[PDB]
Nucleic acid binder design. Structure first.
Ligand SMILES: [Zn+2]
Length: 254
DNA sequence: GGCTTCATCCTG
DNA sequence: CCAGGAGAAGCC
């Protein structure tokens, strides 16, 4: 799961328990158990996302930081229910009527206020593609910046320092949308291409965020190797780029 | 810039 | 069943 999925989940967590007094708090990790007593009777004030980083803010200025990597997943349950599963529970934030459970995640930390700025991941993530304040021409500026203008898109679109929230599926769907392979640099695009890329970097993630869980978002190439491209009819192929699987259409990506 | 590595879950 | 496959940091 990447940005869009994490924000959908964060929205579900806030709907479940934002503002509601915690009646129980449980952490699997021994070093976090000390926060159990401290948080009972506090409440989540909001669940912030910074790309794939999920920050659950509490009313006593603590912030639970969690990153699902490839395997973590949140689930909202009615309080006291525990749908059977083989995943290991890692976090329970429980209120009178709704409880949220975080399973499998291994990167979980309790942050004090300073660390919202200094934590290693939070310190180096770039702007969030789902941030409404983030505009195409800002993305365009960033693409052309000295920092990123010479990066191949293959790696750049996975680098959370560039744009937070982008992941593999988004990488392939964005590059296909604008007809580019992974081996290009922002410096060598024409202005039309650059403008198309800057818009797709935002609109595709925002589209997935709005509709993936429900015109609606669909993969055009991701996991479609062997199928005919819906734009040009060519057969979508699967290779490896940036040591991650990569899908693309040889017929209309150049 | 290329691994090498960690981490959990699912499949094949 | 066991191995490989599926986000980010580390060590050159
Ligand atoms: Zn095509």
């Amino acid at each position: 799961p990447q940005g869009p999925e994490i924000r959908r989940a964060a929205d579900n967590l806030e709907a479940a328990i934002k503002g509601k007094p915690l009646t129980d708090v449980w952490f699997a990790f021994p070093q976090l158990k000390t926060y159990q007593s401290q948080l009972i009777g506090q409440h989540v004030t909001h669940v912030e996302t910074r790309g794939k980083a999920l920050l659950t803010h509490f009313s006593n200025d603590l912030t639970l930081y969690s990153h699902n990597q490839l395997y973590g997943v949140w689930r909202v349950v009615d309080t006291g229910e525990e749908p059977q599963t083989t995943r290991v529970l890692r976090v329970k934030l429980q209120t009178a009527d709704k409880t949220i459970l975080l399973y499998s995640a291994s990167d979980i930390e309790m942050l004090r206020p300073e660390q919202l700025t200094t934590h290693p991941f939070l310190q180096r993530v770039g702007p969030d593609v789902l941030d409404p304040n983030l505009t195409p021409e800002v993305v365009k500026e960033r693409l052309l910046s000295p920092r990123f203008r010479n990066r191949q898109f293959a790696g750049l679109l996975l680098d959370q320092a560039f744009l937070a929230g982008l992941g593999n599926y988004l990488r392939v769907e964005i590059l296909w949308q604008v007809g580019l392979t992974g081996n290009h640099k922002a410096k060598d695009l024409n202005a039309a291409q650059l403008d198309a890329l800057a818009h797709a970097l935002l609109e595709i993630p925002r589209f997935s965020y709005a509709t993936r869980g429900q015109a609606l978002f669909r993969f055009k190439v991701f996991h479609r190797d062997g199928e005919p491209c819906e734009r040009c009819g060519s057969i979508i192929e699967k290779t490896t780029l940036s040591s991650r699987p990569f899908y693309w259409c040889p017929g209309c990506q150049h």
